[PDB]
Scaffold this active site. Sequence first.
Site, short mmCIF file in Angstrom:
data_model
loop_
_atom_site.label_atom_id
_atom_site.label_comp_id
_atom_site.label_asym_id
_atom_site.label_seq_id
_atom_site.Cartn_x
_atom_site.Cartn_y
_atom_site.Cartn_z
N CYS A 38 67.39 15.11 53.25
CA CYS A 38 68.65 14.83 52.57
C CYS A 38 68.67 15.16 51.10
CB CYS A 38 69.02 13.37 52.79
SG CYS A 38 69.50 13.07 54.48
N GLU A 47 75.58 5.57 55.49
CA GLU A 47 76.71 5.50 56.39
C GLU A 47 76.63 4.12 57.02
OE1 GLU A 47 78.43 8.87 58.66
OE2 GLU A 47 79.97 7.42 58.02
N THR A 48 75.52 3.86 57.72
CA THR A 48 75.34 2.63 58.47
C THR A 48 75.32 1.38 57.59
OG1 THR A 48 74.25 3.81 60.27
CG2 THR A 48 73.88 1.42 60.16
N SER A 49 74.44 1.35 56.58
CA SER A 49 74.34 0.18 55.70
C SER A 49 75.56 -0.03 54.82
CB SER A 49 73.06 0.20 54.85
OG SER A 49 72.54 1.52 54.69
N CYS A 85 61.26 8.86 56.92
CA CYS A 85 61.43 9.86 55.89
C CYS A 85 60.07 10.45 55.53
CB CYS A 85 62.12 9.23 54.67
SG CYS A 85 62.17 10.26 53.19
N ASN A 133 63.08 16.34 50.97
CA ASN A 133 63.17 15.81 52.33
C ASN A 133 64.41 16.36 53.05
OD1 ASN A 133 65.00 14.15 50.68
ND2 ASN A 133 65.16 12.85 52.50
N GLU A 173 67.13 14.02 48.39
CA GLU A 173 66.97 13.01 47.32
C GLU A 173 65.50 12.64 47.05
OE1 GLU A 173 67.31 12.18 50.34
OE2 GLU A 173 66.84 10.11 50.79
N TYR A 208 72.84 19.03 47.75
CA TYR A 208 72.87 18.80 49.18
C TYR A 208 74.10 19.48 49.75
CZ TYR A 208 72.13 16.15 53.44
OH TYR A 208 71.99 15.69 54.71
N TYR A 209 74.76 18.81 50.68
CA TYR A 209 75.85 19.38 51.47
C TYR A 209 76.97 20.02 50.65
CZ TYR A 209 79.30 19.45 55.30
OH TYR A 209 80.19 19.84 56.26
N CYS A 248 58.33 7.85 52.15
CA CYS A 248 59.09 7.02 51.22
C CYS A 248 59.80 5.91 51.97
CB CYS A 248 60.10 7.87 50.44
SG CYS A 248 60.62 7.14 48.87
N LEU A 263 46.98 29.58 60.67
CA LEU A 263 47.34 29.09 62.00
C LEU A 263 46.91 27.63 62.19
CD1 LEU A 263 46.46 32.15 64.33
CD2 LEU A 263 48.73 31.58 63.39
N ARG A 266 52.82 33.80 54.64
CA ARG A 266 52.91 35.19 54.19
C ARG A 266 53.96 35.97 54.98
NH1 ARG A 266 46.96 37.19 55.03
NH2 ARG A 266 46.63 34.99 54.40
#
Lengths: 152, 584, 734, 16, 16
Positions: free
Chosen positions: B286, B470-472, B72, B284, B288, B577-578, B309, B81, B109
């Site tokens: 997501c 989702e995963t955790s 993150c 970031n 948060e 967010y979404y 983070c 440049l 700009r």
Amino acid sequence: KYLVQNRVTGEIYESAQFLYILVAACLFSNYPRETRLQYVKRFYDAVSTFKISLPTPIMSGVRTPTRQFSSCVLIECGDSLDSINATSSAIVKYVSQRAGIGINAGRIRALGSPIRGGEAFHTGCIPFYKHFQTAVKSCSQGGVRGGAATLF
Amino acid sequence: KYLVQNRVTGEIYESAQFLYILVAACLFSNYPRETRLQYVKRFYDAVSTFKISLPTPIMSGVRTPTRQFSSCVLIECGDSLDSINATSSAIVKYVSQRAGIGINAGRIRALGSPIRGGEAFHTGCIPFYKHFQTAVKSCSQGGVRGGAATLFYPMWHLEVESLLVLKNNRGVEGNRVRHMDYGVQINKLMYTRLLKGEDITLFSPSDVPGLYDAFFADQEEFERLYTKYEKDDSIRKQRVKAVELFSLMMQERASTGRIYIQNVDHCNTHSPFDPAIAPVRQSNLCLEIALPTKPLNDVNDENGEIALCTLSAFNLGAINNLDELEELAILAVRALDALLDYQDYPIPAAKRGAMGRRTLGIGVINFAYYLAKHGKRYSDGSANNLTHKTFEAIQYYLLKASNELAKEQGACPWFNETTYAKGILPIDTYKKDLDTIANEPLHYDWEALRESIKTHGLRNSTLSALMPSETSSQISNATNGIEPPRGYVSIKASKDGILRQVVPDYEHLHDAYELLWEMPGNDGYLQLVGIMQKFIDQSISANTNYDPSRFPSGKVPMQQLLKDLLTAYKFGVKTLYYQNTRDG
Amino acid sequence: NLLVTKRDGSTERINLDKIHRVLDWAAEGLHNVSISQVELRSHIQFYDGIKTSDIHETIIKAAADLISRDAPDYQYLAARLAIFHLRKKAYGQFEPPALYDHVVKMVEMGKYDNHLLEDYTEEEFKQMDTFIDHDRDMTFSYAAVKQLEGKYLVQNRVTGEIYESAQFLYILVAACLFSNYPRETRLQYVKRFYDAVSTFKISLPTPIMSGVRTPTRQFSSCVLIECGDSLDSINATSSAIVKYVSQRAGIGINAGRIRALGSPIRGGEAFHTGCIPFYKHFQTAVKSCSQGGVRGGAATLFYPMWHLEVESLLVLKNNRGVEGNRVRHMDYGVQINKLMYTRLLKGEDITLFSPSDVPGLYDAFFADQEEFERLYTKYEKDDSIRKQRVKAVELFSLMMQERASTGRIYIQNVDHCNTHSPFDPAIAPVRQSNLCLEIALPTKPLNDVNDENGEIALCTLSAFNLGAINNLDELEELAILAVRALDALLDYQDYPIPAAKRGAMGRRTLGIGVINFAYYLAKHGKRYSDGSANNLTHKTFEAIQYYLLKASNELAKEQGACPWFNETTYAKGILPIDTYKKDLDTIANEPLHYDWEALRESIKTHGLRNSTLSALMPSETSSQISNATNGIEPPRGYVSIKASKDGILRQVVPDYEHLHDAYELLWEMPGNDGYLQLVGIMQKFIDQSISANTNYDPSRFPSGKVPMQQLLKDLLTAYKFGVKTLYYQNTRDG
Amino acid sequence: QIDSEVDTDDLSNFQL
Amino acid sequence: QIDSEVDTDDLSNFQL
């Protein structure tokens, strides 16, 4: 594209022989007083009678406050993210000065290749080629006109 | 994705408790022999009984020879440049380590701007955005799967109308940058112009001295500079009707679900950071994470700042009461803080951020389940006081753990740049309107904590952020983040068959749950987000939701889309967010 | 705390107790409704500084959003909340002012016509105010109120302000229509008409309900124009259409007289080029006052089945084809008689002619079927006359296929319209219908918009609410009220075209029908599809027509028969019961319960105030106001759904709780026979016609396709039972 | 949607 | 999917 002018207002400030004599005067300015003006006269005669031709950056810029005259650059990329980034950065820098680029990228390892203790060349040449393209195109009107490269 | 295994051959080498005990052993390895094994046992018990959840990089990698755990990252691009190149290079470096990126690029700009004695910003923001995309995508299987970023710019940017439509399908390829998301940055004055049916003036950041800075740091100075520049007829500008600008944004938010919102005033008036020194000018991937950044000169510029983070979450369903959070906060903060010294930093400017501020982001999972088993709901205001009570407990205990760690190990180097240093707390700076929707009293002694923070400081500049999971959450059989489940049974495809998961305690709770589409509208949820935000250091990955079939002729009205946006703002919501639109 | 912005601009703290009290009031008498549910759903949407009216829309909508079949009473909760809000918007309080003060103020603002204060004294308005019961506003359903607010109640179009409530509308419609009545009876008629409309016994068209009491006199919404075969008549017709459609009237256009493509050079004019370019001209006329050329403006155009161009005409609504061959934004009625049907049955040919080549044929088609037969076969034999032969099965198939594609190719059985009719066909034949195929009246072509020798037919409409009456003998009083009210309106309304005034003053034609038929069948335990309703229908429609005729007869004694009464079959002592299709005897055996022979002599002697009285129209607006099932139609479902800028509007069929099994929904009908037998039975008694639908569910048929064999049998069944017209064909989707 | 075949024999029976 | 008409009058009431 040659004569010194105001882009905004449209005004033209010089004529062709002034361009020719002052390109000559600039390029031979460091010559010893004994020969300097002979070289100038002879170079002026050669360009003004079309015997010798010069790139647009030179003909438009030499005599003016600019020093940007490199229009033809060749960069070779190494098989590493550090080299990929450096290459990308050099492209951006040069294409902002309207230079054409030759990019050698044949050294980048192919899709599927072993995990380089950190980096990500598993995914192949193509996503990096795409990155070179947007680099080449980074200073182009709406992403099309301007910015040119050949990749090897 | 967790257990140590051979990618090639398929062999699995470990079981879950070994993963858990050895994650614990690694994170507390430097602890004095007198306490080390007590911390290990207690952290092992917390993760193995699902009280605390950790990111995939941590759970898959800590115990193994890798040190790549940063997932993150936040990078701010300067109008040059050199900064564009440095930003691009930092993106490539981090995405090769599968990190999500927040890119702030609103400083570039606009198309048409004056010839910068060498460079080429005549041509605009878009060709550089395209360059950031290919950077983000540089390590992705065939250019699609893998590599993710959200890019930020202010609503008043001269090119905003072109920017708003980058994700749009139809159009010329040169006008589109489809594989990044975007966050539009808004403040009170922009909303005011909408309400008063007035105009909004677009400027290039390069023509308006001080305007960009004030936008984040000081709304009074923003107002002064903004109206001043609207009057100067020597400055290049463009007028648009606020209703037309908002409509375009909300319509693109609706089409893609992926045009986001950041209320930059709220991110700076209610924040752990002093905006005069360390303003929050982006988020970031997501939406948060809210942390200070500084543009780079060069990949290796020691004066830039990339924000990082480290994340975790409390499983609100695995605790019998809120006072368990005291021990869990100690464990989580100590574990994550140790990881900061353990992990690698491929970019000097990112190390600066991490060692300077030592920023953590601890959130929650199983919120829906927790509401259901307390007999509350999202949509009717019944959860308001319970939420107030819950999030007070989280933040108080998080702050207390970090405070205690500062006494033991020292406040973070740049602690003096926090509002915390000035004895200012979240409870001092929240959006006053929250008083009209909850009346739960503070149950914890915040004044004692206040003096303890003035005196000893905090090990960490931030502690709390409400991320999506989702995963955790699947590992705990928890409902995801703060979100209501779409349904009672979740379905996922795999090469091993259809994977089903039933929401926890369906048997006893089926009527107590409130499924996503059972919510009559967005108000109740947004009031809960607002209440959580009272206490949260950073922000929250708040969704908005719309079921076409609840509306005449099956179309979501713009009037409703805008009211919800204003409701979010009025209750102090920092980001949106979404946007989820139901199909069929 | 929570703060509220009051009407003006001032702010006071929110009053949760006040909101609760109004909700409690609204919920009184209702069942299975949750005040707290409504509170929860609306209070979560409130915000500090919310304006007062916005609190009201929110609670209303919260109540409205819970309307369902299992909790139907949310219709009434939401309705009452809405009524409350509207009292405040209009009066700044819930109690309405005294009737006199209200009217005085409205005249001042220019919203009510000032004749009201001229025609009635303050004492009389005081008296009228005692008739009023503002609590009857509590009887409306939610959709009823949205209809009142949308199109009935007097209001500012621009600003949004509402100026009146429903009982004022009702009392002042009554006061206007009976304003010329002798002082001895005037106020009794007013009270009794007010009671009938306010308790939903009688329903009235939108122009009447929105306009009577206001300075307008535009109330004609149903006009019939017949075009002659000349450019002068074409122009006059076009001009009359434009004039009427600017007043939002629906039009029936008869254009079957226009000579076919190819016909001889009319010493000047240009009918070489055919019917179609003129049909296109009628369409743009109909559409001349419509928002962007689409929404608003409606017409049905009529021609005979045997017209030389009929094959081109039949396909005008078809999507594919060259734009010059299409006239898509009008409907069509094909005119058919017994001989055309005979050619179909006998598998024979039908001969097409241009009306201009066959002297007398057009006239006989409507007036005299024997002369039609004679002239028709004669002209088929004359090989000097231009003609075209087609197989009857091919002609009918094409028609029925286009009827099926669009649902909007209609049928008129012109023999039945003239053998069973209030008019003598030798003098005043019926040669067309209206937009909706229930109106059947004489017409005469115009020379010129202002031709005093043309006749445009007009009809004033109303309906009896069959569900709001305990028994059929209530119809006696309701018929008196309805006929008198409508007859007065004939003298009150304006006439923008001389030929239309002729029709209205000449014949004084009314068209009174019904609503809530389905509900009425259900609560008598009958159905549409099985023949169980036959005798009940006979009994019902006898009562309607008898009482309608009796009221008009009584009005003729008092005020005089209509000028052209002598052109009716009524004048010759002929009644509907004398001329109906005999086959009806095989499907009902209900005896006549009323004394028709007494009525017969009373009609021979004193005549009728009105040449027609009955017509069965479709309803939507007036039936929604009564929470009635529409016209004679079975509901598609138990819950109706409509879109608005205010949310989804739901209405549950009346007494769903006790009747859900007694109802027969449209698609529960195995087929069309039972319904068509009921239409046939109603037609026995009805003066004009009926907006009869046919219905087809593809999924009831092999391979999901409606067979032509079935489409044609239903057509013949309609004819055999004396059905005059067939309106919309409904095909279910999915 | 519709099937266009017609039996003229079965129709001829009908009584108008 | 979405209806783009906005009432600016009804918005102006709102309190930020």
